[PDB]
């Protein structure tokens, strides 16, 4: 029921919004599970792991370069902007809204959201392999040798770039190979971020889930922390619920239509 949510929305002093791939998918971003089926012919195993980056950093960078460049034509959808506007409107009332997102596309930041937690990192940050510095990087193309590269057609000539010409660390005494500041399969989440999110999710008195479900990662880590304190949880996703056993609040349909009415 809508007005039952809206009652909580009016009371709530500290909202936490967890976002998944559904929200990014409604902006046309390829997310390798739903839209953009696969890239070239490859799978996560030779693309999104530390092993695969050690074996073939050209191919991984080719892949991540593609995903940076597609963002120039993908824009924030109404869910992204409704959240961001809501944050600002509530923040000025002395009411917090924070975003915990699995998404690496920075669409929340482009929408206007400020208090964001990127638990899988960002396409537009680089971590250096030598010294470990993290830098924002929206340079297109990220490095000369990748210009026009990373084409998605399964029969494209591999760029096969010499490693010393892949993106390197601008701090001159280093010159380390960079990588996307992204959380790959088989790596761990950052401990400092998880603590901060624990703190926020303990503070919160209304938790939203958008583009994913509470059963599945990453919402399942914390939605037990919030629900166990009697905090209401609201899902805005595309999956249905059972014939009889409803959710407490669940709004089926696209986030672009469901969410902006909810947060006005």
């Amino acid at each position: 029921d809508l007005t039952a949510f809206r009652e909580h929305f009016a009371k709530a002093k500290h909202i936490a919004i967890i976002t998944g791939a559904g929200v990014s998918a409604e902006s046309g971003v390829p997310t390798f599970r739903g839209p953009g089926g696969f890239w070239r012919k490859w799978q996560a195993q030779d693309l999104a792991t530390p092993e695969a980056f050690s074996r073939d950093p050209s191919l991984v960078w080719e892949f991540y370069h593609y995903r940076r460049e597609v963002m120039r034509s993908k824009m924030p959808n109404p869910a992204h902007l409704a959240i961001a506007e809501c944050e600002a409107r509530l923040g000025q009332q002395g009411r917090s809204v924070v975003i915990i997102t699995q998404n690496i596309d920075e669409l929340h930041h482009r929408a206007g959201s400020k208090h964001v937690y990127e638990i899988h990192g960002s396409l537009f940050k680089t971590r250096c392999m030598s010294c470990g510095e993290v830098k924002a990087n929206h340079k297109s193309p990220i490095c000369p040798a990748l210009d026009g590269k990373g084409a998605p057609d399964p029969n494209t000539k591999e760029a096969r770039i010499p490693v010393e010409l892949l993106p390197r660390c601008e701090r001159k005494s280093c010159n380390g190979l960079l990588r996307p500041h992204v959380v790959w399969f088989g790596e761990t989440l950052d401990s400092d971020i998880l603590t901060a999110v624990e703190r926020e999710l303990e503070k919160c008195d209304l938790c939203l889930v958008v583009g994913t479900s509470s059963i599945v990662y990453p919402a399942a880590m914390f939605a037990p922390q919030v629900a166990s304190r009697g905090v209401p949880v609201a899902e805005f996703n595309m999956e249905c619920t059972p014939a009889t056993q409803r959710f407490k609040y669940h709004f089926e349909g696209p986030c672009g239509s469901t969410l902006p009415p909810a947060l006005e």
């Binding site: 790596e187 990662y217 990453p218």
Partner: peptide
């Protein structure tokens, strides 16, 4: 520290 997708 937490494995993303909990491993698989």
């Amino acid at each position: 520290x937490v494995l993303x997708e909990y491993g698989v």
